[PDB]
Amino acid sequence: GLLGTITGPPQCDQFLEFSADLIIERREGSDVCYPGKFVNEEALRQILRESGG
Amino acid sequence: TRKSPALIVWGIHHSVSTAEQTKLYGSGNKLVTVGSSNYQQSFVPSPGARPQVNGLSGRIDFHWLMLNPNDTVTFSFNGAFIAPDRASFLRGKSMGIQSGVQVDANC
Amino acid sequence: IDKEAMGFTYSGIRTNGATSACRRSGSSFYAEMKWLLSNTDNAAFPQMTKSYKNTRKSPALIVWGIHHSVSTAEQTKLYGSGNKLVTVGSSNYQQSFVPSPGARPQVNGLSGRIDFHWLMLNPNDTVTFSFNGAFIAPDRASFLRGKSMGIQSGVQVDANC
Amino acid sequence: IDKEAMGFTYSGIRTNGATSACRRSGSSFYAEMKWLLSNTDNAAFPQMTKSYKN
Ligand SMILES: *[C@@H]1O[C@H](CO)[C@@H](O)[C@H](O)[C@H]1NC(C)=O
Ligand SMILES: *[C@@H]1O[C@H](CO)[C@@H](O)[C@H](O)[C@H]1NC(C)=O
Ligand SMILES: [Ca+2]
Ligand SMILES: [Ca+2]
């Protein structure tokens, strides 16, 4: 999941310092590994989308 | 230290049993008071019984904050705190999209 | 909406809280809710935990309430001396609650205040209530029916036109 | 904006809370706020209730 690139759950190990021009979220994406959510999560999603990595 | 804003991210552990919260961080009330020049907030764990997602009925929720340059973020805590080891920084421009089809590198 | 019972059971406490505000046949309370009180006045409120699962195939509206009494005395009167905590929890929810007793301007003569919260319980999910006082409990969950349109107005209805 | 007094009066506590941040005739505070401190250091702040009507 896009937010997982910040915290760093095991699915997001490849993208902890990723750099992109086009970021593609998928449905199967998971921001997390231990049960829990993000606070104000779309706001931060929208930021990382245009972050270039 | 850098000249672009910094992404700081922490986490609070809302436990399942109040006993689990004492077992880990010690008994008594827990409090995290994130502070910056722009951001003054405060967070408290909420230990209580929950349906078990992936097993652990505990819950680690994440919060975030944008720290301006030359600015300092101050954490003040006494338990139930997931700590940031590294800050995140943004590299430039990108397009965020959401799809379920392949990626054609040729078109 | 279609209401469905949530299956909750309580022992050792009361379950018939009422007030002059919600007057039915004399004093009463919300139809789909049940005010929970210590078994007798100033008694102890036991620590309870109740759970409901959305067994149907559409989300379930779960509405509970917190009673911020007017006086800390009224809070000890109804639920008992000692601190009071309510931890609502599902798979998408993870929230505690604490009554903040304090005088408020008299609305319907009662300076206490009830905070109504709500959450959407996904199908197959469970909402967990852990509490020991100051908890207005849900009796029936609500489910949505179909399509409608909400309008606000101030004129007659006319089925001829 | 027009300002009108709210008619709040206190006792058993202090009302002169000020700080070096809000500087006037020395250290002061907000003109429309009143920093309520306990009557003395570590003295229990008595529970209070005040009301204003528009
Ligand atoms: C803060 O601003 C001063 C301006 O004199 C500059 O010299 C210094 O490098 C800056 N530090 C950071 C961390 O931005
Ligand atoms: C809920 O989960 C159980 C166990 O996996 C399953 O048998 C049941 O069909 C599920 N309910 C729905 C509505 O899918
Ligand atoms: Ca029916
Ligand atoms: Ca005036």
mmCIF file of C-alpha atoms and ligand atoms in Angstrom:
data_model
loop_
_atom_site.group_PDB
_atom_site.id
_atom_site.type_symbol
_atom_site.label_atom_id
_atom_site.label_comp_id
_atom_site.label_asym_id
_atom_site.label_seq_id
_atom_site.Cartn_x
_atom_site.Cartn_y
_atom_site.Cartn_z
ATOM 1 C CA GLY A 1 0.000 0.000 0.000
ATOM 2 C CA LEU A 2 1.088 3.558 -0.694
ATOM 3 C CA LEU A 3 1.257 4.485 3.001
ATOM 4 C CA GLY A 4 3.299 1.346 3.714
ATOM 5 C CA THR A 5 6.318 2.912 2.017
ATOM 6 C CA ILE A 6 6.635 5.243 5.044
ATOM 7 C CA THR A 7 6.155 2.843 7.965
ATOM 8 C CA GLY A 8 7.575 -0.192 6.183
ATOM 9 C CA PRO A 9 5.622 -3.411 6.635
ATOM 10 C CA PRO A 10 7.134 -6.526 5.023
ATOM 11 C CA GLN A 11 5.177 -6.170 1.766
ATOM 12 C CA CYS A 12 6.706 -2.692 1.304
ATOM 13 C CA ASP A 13 10.388 -3.565 1.757
ATOM 14 C CA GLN A 14 11.207 -2.875 -1.905
ATOM 15 C CA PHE A 15 9.778 0.664 -1.866
ATOM 16 C CA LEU A 16 11.051 2.294 1.337
ATOM 17 C CA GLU A 17 13.156 4.678 -0.793
ATOM 18 C CA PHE A 18 11.366 4.247 -4.106
ATOM 19 C CA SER A 19 11.478 6.871 -6.846
ATOM 20 C CA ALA A 20 8.786 7.081 -9.507
ATOM 21 C CA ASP A 21 7.120 9.224 -12.131
ATOM 22 C CA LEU A 22 4.037 6.971 -12.185
ATOM 23 C CA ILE A 23 2.827 5.309 -8.974
ATOM 24 C CA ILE A 24 0.214 2.583 -9.430
ATOM 25 C CA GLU A 25 -1.842 1.560 -6.422
ATOM 26 C CA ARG A 26 -3.498 -1.843 -6.594
ATOM 27 C CA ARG A 27 -6.508 -3.151 -4.696
ATOM 28 C CA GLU A 28 -4.416 -5.930 -3.096
ATOM 29 C CA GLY A 29 -2.211 -3.247 -1.564
ATOM 30 C CA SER A 30 -1.958 -3.200 2.223
ATOM 31 C CA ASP A 31 -0.624 -0.204 4.157
ATOM 32 C CA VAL A 32 -0.054 -2.258 7.289
ATOM 33 C CA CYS A 33 0.991 -5.602 8.810
ATOM 34 C CA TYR A 34 -0.115 -5.422 12.477
ATOM 35 C CA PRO A 35 -3.848 -4.533 12.674
ATOM 36 C CA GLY A 36 -4.396 -0.785 12.511
ATOM 37 C CA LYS A 37 -5.211 2.178 10.296
ATOM 38 C CA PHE A 38 -3.782 5.564 9.346
ATOM 39 C CA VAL A 39 -5.176 8.841 10.660
ATOM 40 C CA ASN A 40 -6.222 11.291 7.915
ATOM 41 C CA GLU A 41 -5.090 8.643 5.484
ATOM 42 C CA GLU A 42 -6.334 9.980 2.151
ATOM 43 C CA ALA A 43 -4.707 13.362 2.791
ATOM 44 C CA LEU A 44 -1.352 11.582 3.136
ATOM 45 C CA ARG A 45 -2.110 9.215 0.241
ATOM 46 C CA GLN A 46 -2.738 12.240 -1.984
ATOM 47 C CA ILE A 47 0.626 13.664 -0.883
ATOM 48 C CA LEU A 48 2.710 10.571 -1.653
ATOM 49 C CA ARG A 49 0.937 10.168 -5.011
ATOM 50 C CA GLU A 50 2.610 13.326 -6.368
ATOM 51 C CA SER A 51 5.756 12.834 -4.262
ATOM 52 C CA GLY A 52 7.941 11.407 -7.034
ATOM 53 C CA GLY A 53 9.024 8.840 -4.459
ATOM 54 C CA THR B 1 18.263 19.699 8.660
ATOM 55 C CA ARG B 2 17.197 19.857 4.997
ATOM 56 C CA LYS B 3 15.376 22.689 3.216
ATOM 57 C CA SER B 4 12.218 20.798 2.220
ATOM 58 C CA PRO B 5 9.513 19.775 4.729
ATOM 59 C CA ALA B 6 9.920 16.441 6.499
ATOM 60 C CA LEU B 7 7.356 13.661 6.932
ATOM 61 C CA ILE B 8 7.302 12.484 10.552
ATOM 62 C CA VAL B 9 5.175 9.437 11.383
ATOM 63 C CA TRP B 10 4.531 7.851 14.782
ATOM 64 C CA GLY B 11 2.167 5.204 16.117
ATOM 65 C CA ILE B 12 0.048 4.438 19.167
ATOM 66 C CA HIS B 13 -0.609 0.891 20.400
ATOM 67 C CA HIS B 14 -4.231 0.499 21.474
ATOM 68 C CA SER B 15 -3.967 -2.833 23.292
ATOM 69 C CA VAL B 16 -6.589 -5.551 23.781
ATOM 70 C CA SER B 17 -6.444 -5.944 27.564
ATOM 71 C CA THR B 18 -5.505 -3.172 29.963
ATOM 72 C CA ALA B 19 -3.273 -5.885 31.448
ATOM 73 C CA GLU B 20 -1.383 -6.190 28.156
ATOM 74 C CA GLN B 21 -0.785 -2.429 28.282
ATOM 75 C CA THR B 22 0.665 -2.778 31.789
ATOM 76 C CA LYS B 23 2.657 -5.855 30.736
ATOM 77 C CA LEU B 24 4.397 -3.868 27.977
ATOM 78 C CA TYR B 25 4.666 -0.191 28.944
ATOM 79 C CA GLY B 26 3.793 -0.435 32.634
ATOM 80 C CA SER B 27 0.593 0.349 34.479
ATOM 81 C CA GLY B 28 -0.806 3.851 34.747
ATOM 82 C CA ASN B 29 -2.094 6.304 32.175
ATOM 83 C CA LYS B 30 -0.044 6.739 29.005
ATOM 84 C CA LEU B 31 0.267 9.942 27.004
ATOM 85 C CA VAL B 32 2.091 11.064 23.854
ATOM 86 C CA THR B 33 2.250 14.815 23.192
ATOM 87 C CA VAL B 34 3.668 15.530 19.749
ATOM 88 C CA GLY B 35 4.787 19.131 19.476
ATOM 89 C CA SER B 36 6.264 21.384 16.813
ATOM 90 C CA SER B 37 6.044 25.059 15.938
ATOM 91 C CA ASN B 38 3.027 24.325 13.701
ATOM 92 C CA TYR B 39 1.604 21.195 15.341
ATOM 93 C CA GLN B 40 0.379 20.713 18.911
ATOM 94 C CA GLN B 41 -1.531 17.494 19.514
ATOM 95 C CA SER B 42 -1.709 14.696 22.046
ATOM 96 C CA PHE B 43 -2.549 11.001 21.879
ATOM 97 C CA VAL B 44 -3.696 8.352 24.369
ATOM 98 C CA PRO B 45 -3.998 4.547 24.030
ATOM 99 C CA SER B 46 -7.432 2.918 24.190
ATOM 100 C CA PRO B 47 -7.027 -0.639 25.516
ATOM 101 C CA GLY B 48 -10.155 -2.737 25.050
ATOM 102 C CA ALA B 49 -11.422 -6.020 23.681
ATOM 103 C CA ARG B 50 -11.632 -6.210 19.885
ATOM 104 C CA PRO B 51 -12.184 -8.794 17.156
ATOM 105 C CA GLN B 52 -8.873 -10.370 16.224
ATOM 106 C CA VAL B 53 -7.555 -9.154 12.867
ATOM 107 C CA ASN B 54 -4.680 -11.397 11.715
ATOM 108 C CA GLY B 55 -4.711 -12.731 15.274
ATOM 109 C CA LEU B 56 -3.588 -9.877 17.507
ATOM 110 C CA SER B 57 -6.658 -8.014 18.760
ATOM 111 C CA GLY B 58 -4.291 -5.150 19.543
ATOM 112 C CA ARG B 59 -4.178 -2.198 17.182
ATOM 113 C CA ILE B 60 -1.289 0.044 16.089
ATOM 114 C CA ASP B 61 -2.667 3.221 14.509
ATOM 115 C CA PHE B 62 -0.342 5.636 12.713
ATOM 116 C CA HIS B 63 -0.350 9.442 12.675
ATOM 117 C CA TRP B 64 1.676 11.879 10.591
ATOM 118 C CA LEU B 65 2.895 15.478 10.490
ATOM 119 C CA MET B 66 4.780 17.762 8.090
ATOM 120 C CA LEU B 67 7.766 19.414 9.802
ATOM 121 C CA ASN B 68 8.920 22.634 8.133
ATOM 122 C CA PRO B 69 12.627 23.397 7.595
ATOM 123 C CA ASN B 70 14.717 24.664 10.516
ATOM 124 C CA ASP B 71 11.826 23.361 12.643
ATOM 125 C CA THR B 72 11.914 20.723 15.373
ATOM 126 C CA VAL B 73 9.294 18.116 16.288
ATOM 127 C CA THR B 74 9.151 17.156 19.969
ATOM 128 C CA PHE B 75 7.799 13.825 21.199
ATOM 129 C CA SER B 76 6.928 13.357 24.870
ATOM 130 C CA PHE B 77 5.769 9.911 25.898
ATOM 131 C CA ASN B 78 5.707 7.288 28.644
ATOM 132 C CA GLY B 79 4.584 4.117 26.849
ATOM 133 C CA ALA B 80 2.362 2.710 24.092
ATOM 134 C CA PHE B 81 4.443 4.594 21.530
ATOM 135 C CA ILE B 82 5.669 3.314 18.165
ATOM 136 C CA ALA B 83 8.755 5.358 17.429
ATOM 137 C CA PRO B 84 10.013 6.787 14.118
ATOM 138 C CA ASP B 85 13.555 5.712 13.323
ATOM 139 C CA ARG B 86 13.794 7.559 9.989
ATOM 140 C CA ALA B 87 12.013 10.543 8.499
ATOM 141 C CA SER B 88 10.629 10.586 4.959
ATOM 142 C CA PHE B 89 11.324 13.206 2.297
ATOM 143 C CA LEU B 90 9.741 13.818 -1.098
ATOM 144 C CA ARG B 91 11.776 13.539 -4.297
ATOM 145 C CA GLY B 92 9.750 15.528 -6.840
ATOM 146 C CA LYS B 93 6.763 15.052 -9.143
ATOM 147 C CA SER B 94 4.749 11.931 -9.898
ATOM 148 C CA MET B 95 1.312 10.772 -10.981
ATOM 149 C CA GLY B 96 -0.751 8.752 -8.526
ATOM 150 C CA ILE B 97 -3.177 6.357 -10.207
ATOM 151 C CA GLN B 98 -5.241 3.319 -9.226
ATOM 152 C CA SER B 99 -5.598 0.480 -11.723
ATOM 153 C CA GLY B 100 -6.017 -3.252 -12.191
ATOM 154 C CA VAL B 101 -4.535 -3.793 -15.653
ATOM 155 C CA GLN B 102 -1.024 -4.552 -16.882
ATOM 156 C CA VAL B 103 1.815 -2.083 -17.440
ATOM 157 C CA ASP B 104 2.715 -1.710 -21.125
ATOM 158 C CA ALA B 105 6.272 -0.388 -21.298
ATOM 159 C CA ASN B 106 6.041 -0.165 -25.107
ATOM 160 C CA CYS B 107 2.980 2.078 -25.516
ATOM 161 C CA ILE C 1 -34.572 1.089 7.906
ATOM 162 C CA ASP C 2 -35.099 -2.437 9.217
ATOM 163 C CA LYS C 3 -34.274 -2.937 12.895
ATOM 164 C CA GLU C 4 -32.774 -6.174 14.200
ATOM 165 C CA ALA C 5 -32.161 -7.182 17.801
ATOM 166 C CA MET C 6 -28.516 -7.362 18.855
ATOM 167 C CA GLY C 7 -28.920 -10.140 21.428
ATOM 168 C CA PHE C 8 -27.433 -8.418 24.475
ATOM 169 C CA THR C 9 -28.028 -9.735 27.997
ATOM 170 C CA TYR C 10 -27.219 -8.111 31.343
ATOM 171 C CA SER C 11 -27.254 -9.387 34.918
ATOM 172 C CA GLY C 12 -26.284 -7.729 38.182
ATOM 173 C CA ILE C 13 -27.149 -4.256 36.865
ATOM 174 C CA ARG C 14 -30.298 -2.335 35.996
ATOM 175 C CA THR C 15 -31.703 -2.002 32.481
ATOM 176 C CA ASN C 16 -34.709 0.306 32.871
ATOM 177 C CA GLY C 17 -33.275 3.808 33.064
ATOM 178 C CA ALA C 18 -35.796 6.526 32.293
ATOM 179 C CA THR C 19 -36.363 10.251 32.625
ATOM 180 C CA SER C 20 -39.033 12.931 32.387
ATOM 181 C CA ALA C 21 -37.538 13.980 29.038
ATOM 182 C CA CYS C 22 -38.422 10.819 27.074
ATOM 183 C CA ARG C 23 -42.016 10.485 28.251
ATOM 184 C CA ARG C 24 -44.002 7.505 26.952
ATOM 185 C CA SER C 25 -46.428 5.906 29.465
ATOM 186 C CA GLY C 26 -44.924 8.023 32.184
ATOM 187 C CA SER C 27 -41.142 8.221 32.268
ATOM 188 C CA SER C 28 -39.341 6.143 29.636
ATOM 189 C CA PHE C 29 -36.264 6.117 27.402
ATOM 190 C CA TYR C 30 -35.147 5.570 23.816
ATOM 191 C CA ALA C 31 -37.008 2.666 22.254
ATOM 192 C CA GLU C 32 -33.997 0.999 20.610
ATOM 193 C CA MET C 33 -31.653 1.748 23.541
ATOM 194 C CA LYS C 34 -31.353 0.627 27.159
ATOM 195 C CA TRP C 35 -29.976 2.860 29.897
ATOM 196 C CA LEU C 36 -27.755 0.696 32.113
ATOM 197 C CA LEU C 37 -27.308 1.517 35.803
ATOM 198 C CA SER C 38 -25.729 0.013 38.898
ATOM 199 C CA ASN C 39 -28.104 -2.507 40.451
ATOM 200 C CA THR C 40 -28.985 -0.089 43.250
ATOM 201 C CA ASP C 41 -28.171 3.555 43.917
ATOM 202 C CA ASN C 42 -24.477 4.346 44.444
ATOM 203 C CA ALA C 43 -23.797 0.611 44.029
ATOM 204 C CA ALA C 44 -20.866 -0.769 42.044
ATOM 205 C CA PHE C 45 -21.076 -1.200 38.334
ATOM 206 C CA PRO C 46 -19.549 -4.485 37.170
ATOM 207 C CA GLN C 47 -17.073 -4.570 34.319
ATOM 208 C CA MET C 48 -18.968 -5.987 31.341
ATOM 209 C CA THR C 49 -18.143 -6.899 27.752
ATOM 210 C CA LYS C 50 -20.755 -7.432 25.035
ATOM 211 C CA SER C 51 -20.359 -8.389 21.380
ATOM 212 C CA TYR C 52 -22.541 -8.479 18.274
ATOM 213 C CA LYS C 53 -21.765 -9.873 14.827
ATOM 214 C CA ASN C 54 -23.254 -8.601 11.570
ATOM 215 C CA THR C 55 -24.453 -11.946 10.212
ATOM 216 C CA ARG C 56 -26.380 -10.384 7.308
ATOM 217 C CA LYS C 57 -25.010 -9.389 3.897
ATOM 218 C CA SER C 58 -25.026 -5.578 4.167
ATOM 219 C CA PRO C 59 -23.381 -3.190 6.656
ATOM 220 C CA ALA C 60 -24.966 -2.725 10.081
ATOM 221 C CA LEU C 61 -25.537 0.641 11.753
ATOM 222 C CA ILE C 62 -24.443 0.380 15.402
ATOM 223 C CA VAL C 63 -25.368 3.366 17.594
ATOM 224 C CA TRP C 64 -24.350 3.685 21.257
ATOM 225 C CA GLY C 65 -24.261 6.527 23.760
ATOM 226 C CA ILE C 66 -22.235 8.035 26.591
ATOM 227 C CA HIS C 67 -23.912 9.806 29.525
ATOM 228 C CA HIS C 68 -22.006 12.870 30.712
ATOM 229 C CA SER C 69 -23.964 13.488 33.911
ATOM 230 C CA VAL C 70 -24.422 16.980 35.317
ATOM 231 C CA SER C 71 -22.754 16.192 38.649
ATOM 232 C CA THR C 72 -20.030 13.710 39.507
ATOM 233 C CA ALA C 73 -22.457 12.735 42.277
ATOM 234 C CA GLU C 74 -25.147 11.771 39.760
ATOM 235 C CA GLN C 75 -22.498 9.709 37.967
ATOM 236 C CA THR C 76 -21.616 7.847 41.169
ATOM 237 C CA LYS C 77 -25.339 7.602 41.957
ATOM 238 C CA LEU C 78 -26.188 5.856 38.686
ATOM 239 C CA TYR C 79 -23.036 3.879 37.876
ATOM 240 C CA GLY C 80 -21.050 3.889 41.076
ATOM 241 C CA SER C 81 -17.977 5.449 42.615
ATOM 242 C CA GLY C 82 -14.778 4.806 40.718
ATOM 243 C CA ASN C 83 -13.610 5.767 37.255
ATOM 244 C CA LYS C 84 -15.740 4.828 34.247
ATOM 245 C CA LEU C 85 -14.432 3.657 30.865
ATOM 246 C CA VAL C 86 -16.067 2.463 27.634
ATOM 247 C CA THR C 87 -13.929 0.836 24.927
ATOM 248 C CA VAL C 88 -15.807 0.297 21.678
ATOM 249 C CA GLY C 89 -13.933 -1.904 19.252
ATOM 250 C CA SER C 90 -14.353 -3.593 15.885
ATOM 251 C CA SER C 91 -11.934 -4.378 13.060
ATOM 252 C CA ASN C 92 -12.194 -0.795 11.739
ATOM 253 C CA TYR C 93 -12.798 0.821 15.138
ATOM 254 C CA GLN C 94 -10.633 1.253 18.212
ATOM 255 C CA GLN C 95 -12.061 3.969 20.443
ATOM 256 C CA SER C 96 -12.317 4.548 24.190
ATOM 257 C CA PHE C 97 -14.766 6.838 25.974
ATOM 258 C CA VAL C 98 -14.939 8.582 29.353
ATOM 259 C CA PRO C 99 -17.870 10.469 30.930
ATOM 260 C CA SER C 100 -17.086 14.122 31.600
ATOM 261 C CA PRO C 101 -19.696 15.094 34.203
ATOM 262 C CA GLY C 102 -20.304 18.814 34.374
ATOM 263 C CA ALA C 103 -23.109 21.343 34.538
ATOM 264 C CA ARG C 104 -24.667 22.190 31.182
ATOM 265 C CA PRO C 105 -27.560 24.574 30.457
ATOM 266 C CA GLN C 106 -30.813 22.854 31.344
ATOM 267 C CA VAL C 107 -32.213 21.235 28.198
ATOM 268 C CA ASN C 108 -35.453 19.392 28.994
ATOM 269 C CA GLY C 109 -34.647 20.016 32.655
ATOM 270 C CA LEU C 110 -31.695 17.598 32.698
ATOM 271 C CA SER C 111 -28.223 19.099 32.791
ATOM 272 C CA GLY C 112 -26.735 15.739 31.850
ATOM 273 C CA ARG C 113 -25.848 15.108 28.223
ATOM 274 C CA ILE C 114 -25.843 11.971 26.048
ATOM 275 C CA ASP C 115 -23.277 11.716 23.243
ATOM 276 C CA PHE C 116 -24.519 9.474 20.417
ATOM 277 C CA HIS C 117 -21.856 7.821 18.250
ATOM 278 C CA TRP C 118 -22.249 5.404 15.362
ATOM 279 C CA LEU C 119 -20.221 3.057 13.185
ATOM 280 C CA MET C 120 -20.807 0.854 10.149
ATOM 281 C CA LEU C 121 -20.190 -2.789 11.072
ATOM 282 C CA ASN C 122 -19.001 -4.639 7.976
ATOM 283 C CA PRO C 123 -20.686 -7.979 7.221
ATOM 284 C CA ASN C 124 -19.168 -10.821 9.285
ATOM 285 C CA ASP C 125 -17.515 -8.258 11.588
ATOM 286 C CA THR C 126 -18.016 -7.848 15.336
ATOM 287 C CA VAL C 127 -18.436 -4.733 17.484
ATOM 288 C CA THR C 128 -17.148 -5.102 21.043
ATOM 289 C CA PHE C 129 -18.389 -2.964 23.935
ATOM 290 C CA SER C 130 -16.360 -3.000 27.158
ATOM 291 C CA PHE C 131 -17.767 -0.748 29.864
ATOM 292 C CA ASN C 132 -18.429 -0.293 33.576
ATOM 293 C CA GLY C 133 -20.938 2.568 33.684
ATOM 294 C CA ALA C 134 -22.202 5.688 31.907
ATOM 295 C CA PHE C 135 -23.043 3.597 28.834
ATOM 296 C CA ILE C 136 -26.332 3.913 26.948
ATOM 297 C CA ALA C 137 -26.493 0.528 25.267
ATOM 298 C CA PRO C 138 -27.889 -0.405 21.843
ATOM 299 C CA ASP C 139 -30.801 -2.834 21.798
ATOM 300 C CA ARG C 140 -31.417 -3.221 18.044
ATOM 301 C CA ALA C 141 -29.143 -2.571 15.085
ATOM 302 C CA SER C 142 -30.496 -0.730 12.045
ATOM 303 C CA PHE C 143 -30.171 -1.881 8.427
ATOM 304 C CA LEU C 144 -30.840 0.122 5.280
ATOM 305 C CA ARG C 145 -33.679 -0.781 2.928
ATOM 306 C CA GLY C 146 -33.321 0.606 -0.615
ATOM 307 C CA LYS C 147 -33.272 3.878 -2.544
ATOM 308 C CA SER C 148 -34.952 7.073 -1.388
ATOM 309 C CA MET C 149 -34.449 10.818 -1.617
ATOM 310 C CA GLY C 150 -34.163 13.093 1.378
ATOM 311 C CA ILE C 151 -35.932 16.433 1.064
ATOM 312 C CA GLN C 152 -36.646 19.076 3.676
ATOM 313 C CA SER C 153 -39.791 21.133 3.233
ATOM 314 C CA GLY C 154 -42.512 23.143 4.931
ATOM 315 C CA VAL C 155 -45.610 22.635 2.765
ATOM 316 C CA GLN C 156 -48.397 20.071 2.354
ATOM 317 C CA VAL C 157 -47.989 16.641 0.814
ATOM 318 C CA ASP C 158 -50.220 16.059 -2.219
ATOM 319 C CA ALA C 159 -50.739 12.587 -3.691
ATOM 320 C CA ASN C 160 -52.953 13.938 -6.489
ATOM 321 C CA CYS C 161 -50.130 15.870 -8.181
ATOM 322 C CA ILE D 1 -16.284 43.055 16.314
ATOM 323 C CA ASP D 2 -17.919 44.568 19.385
ATOM 324 C CA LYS D 3 -16.764 43.319 22.789
ATOM 325 C CA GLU D 4 -19.093 43.068 25.785
ATOM 326 C CA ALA D 5 -18.130 41.788 29.223
ATOM 327 C CA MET D 6 -19.196 38.284 30.237
ATOM 328 C CA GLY D 7 -19.597 39.002 33.964
ATOM 329 C CA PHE D 8 -17.319 36.278 35.352
ATOM 330 C CA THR D 9 -15.985 36.570 38.915
ATOM 331 C CA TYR D 10 -13.728 34.165 40.812
ATOM 332 C CA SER D 11 -12.229 33.683 44.264
ATOM 333 C CA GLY D 12 -10.149 31.079 46.050
ATOM 334 C CA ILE D 13 -7.897 31.160 42.967
ATOM 335 C CA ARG D 14 -5.735 33.728 41.200
ATOM 336 C CA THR D 15 -6.667 35.764 38.138
ATOM 337 C CA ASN D 16 -3.366 37.522 37.335
ATOM 338 C CA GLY D 17 -1.661 34.796 35.295
ATOM 339 C CA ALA D 18 0.931 36.337 32.979
ATOM 340 C CA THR D 19 4.078 35.386 31.098
ATOM 341 C CA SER D 20 7.162 36.849 29.446
ATOM 342 C CA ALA D 21 5.661 35.998 26.047
ATOM 343 C CA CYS D 22 2.817 38.557 26.174
ATOM 344 C CA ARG D 23 4.864 41.656 26.947
ATOM 345 C CA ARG D 24 3.200 44.941 27.954
ATOM 346 C CA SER D 25 3.792 46.878 31.204
ATOM 347 C CA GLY D 26 6.206 44.066 31.862
ATOM 348 C CA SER D 27 4.923 40.532 31.550
ATOM 349 C CA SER D 28 1.202 40.339 30.803
ATOM 350 C CA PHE D 29 -1.403 38.212 29.021
ATOM 351 C CA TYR D 30 -4.323 38.473 26.591
ATOM 352 C CA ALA D 31 -6.560 41.509 27.017
ATOM 353 C CA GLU D 32 -9.753 39.450 26.659
ATOM 354 C CA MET D 33 -8.501 36.347 28.489
ATOM 355 C CA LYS D 34 -7.801 35.820 32.179
ATOM 356 C CA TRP D 35 -5.286 33.129 33.111
ATOM 357 C CA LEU D 36 -6.765 31.277 36.097
ATOM 358 C CA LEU D 37 -4.056 29.951 38.415
ATOM 359 C CA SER D 38 -4.585 28.245 41.742
ATOM 360 C CA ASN D 39 -4.638 30.543 44.758
ATOM 361 C CA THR D 40 -1.030 29.553 45.443
ATOM 362 C CA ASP D 41 1.478 27.034 44.120
ATOM 363 C CA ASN D 42 0.188 23.441 44.199
ATOM 364 C CA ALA D 43 -2.928 24.618 46.020
ATOM 365 C CA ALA D 44 -5.882 22.603 44.776
ATOM 366 C CA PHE D 45 -7.867 24.402 42.109
ATOM 367 C CA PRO D 46 -11.472 24.327 43.383
ATOM 368 C CA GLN D 47 -14.012 22.902 40.966
ATOM 369 C CA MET D 48 -16.011 25.790 39.494
ATOM 370 C CA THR D 49 -18.887 26.492 37.121
ATOM 371 C CA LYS D 50 -19.572 29.809 35.385
ATOM 372 C CA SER D 51 -22.276 30.815 32.922
ATOM 373 C CA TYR D 52 -22.922 33.607 30.431
ATOM 374 C CA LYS D 53 -26.128 34.260 28.505
ATOM 375 C CA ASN D 54 -26.250 36.121 25.194
HETATM 376 C C1 LIG E 1 18.188 27.750 9.341
HETATM 377 O O1 LIG E 1 18.299 29.092 8.806
HETATM 378 C C2 LIG E 1 19.625 29.640 8.881
HETATM 379 C C3 LIG E 1 19.542 31.061 8.370
HETATM 380 O O2 LIG E 1 20.631 31.853 8.826
HETATM 381 C C4 LIG E 1 20.589 28.770 8.077
HETATM 382 O O3 LIG E 1 21.907 29.296 8.178
HETATM 383 C C5 LIG E 1 20.546 27.334 8.583
HETATM 384 O O4 LIG E 1 21.374 26.510 7.769
HETATM 385 C C6 LIG E 1 19.110 26.808 8.561
HETATM 386 N N1 LIG E 1 19.050 25.460 9.103
HETATM 387 C C7 LIG E 1 18.207 24.524 8.654
HETATM 388 C C8 LIG E 1 18.280 23.196 9.336
HETATM 389 O O5 LIG E 1 17.418 24.743 7.737
HETATM 390 C C1 LIG E 2 -18.119 -15.228 7.425
HETATM 391 O O1 LIG E 2 -16.965 -16.074 7.595
HETATM 392 C C2 LIG E 2 -17.278 -17.476 7.646
HETATM 393 C C3 LIG E 2 -15.975 -18.211 7.874
HETATM 394 O O2 LIG E 2 -14.999 -17.892 6.891
HETATM 395 C C4 LIG E 2 -17.998 -17.914 6.368
HETATM 396 O O3 LIG E 2 -18.395 -19.274 6.508
HETATM 397 C C5 LIG E 2 -19.213 -17.035 6.089
HETATM 398 O O4 LIG E 2 -19.775 -17.362 4.823
HETATM 399 C C6 LIG E 2 -18.809 -15.563 6.103
HETATM 400 N N1 LIG E 2 -19.962 -14.704 5.873
HETATM 401 C C7 LIG E 2 -20.194 -14.069 4.717
HETATM 402 C C8 LIG E 2 -21.425 -13.213 4.673
HETATM 403 O O5 LIG E 2 -19.446 -14.180 3.750
HETATM 404 CA CA CA E 3 -38.685 -8.016 12.037
HETATM 405 CA CA CA E 4 -20.068 47.290 24.756
#
